[PDB]
């Protein structure tokens, strides 16, 4: 089972990715987690992402396409934050990487900033929380390791605004792209209401999947 999750910054893609991973045994391929990993470990394929991610900008198509091809070689899958541009989507289709399901998370722009201000992460695992809407079982702590949660460098309101602009400029056109793919019989397309509670979005995804 090959799945693409599509949606604005903060739509809840990674939150739902965890549930699909721990159910259908489908590995999460989070380009965002992989680039943050490669920055910390100074890795050749990604270490260059640091200033771009701090700016709220997209990393170059060719770097992430290489990153994804490499990670794919080592495996079903769930693509989370890739593709992010038409040229990334075209690269998957040119390399014959077909998917069974494309799932669009619909969340109004007006929720995103206010949403991401509450985001807390366990960097080592990529588990993510929200201080109000999906809190850890113990305030400030990872549920599994008990380690103090952190705030991502790029989750400052200014950087989120910039990320949401780049999403509408560069990424939102993938909605049309994969809808045409579904129209040609190449994949299933489904939309989920990302404003519902975490639990309901999870059940909506189980109905689709």
Author numbering: 1 to 75, 80 to 213
The authors write:
AK plays a key role in maintaining ATP levels in cells by catalyzing the reaction ATP + AMP ⇄ ADP + ADP. It consists of three domains: the large CORE domain, the LID domain that binds ATP, and the nucleotide monophosphate (NMP)-binding domain that binds AMP. X-ray crystallographic studies showed that the LID and NMP domains undergo a major conformational rearrangement upon substrate binding. This movement, termed domain closure, forms the enzyme’s active center and helps to exclude solvent molecules that might interfere with the chemical reaction.
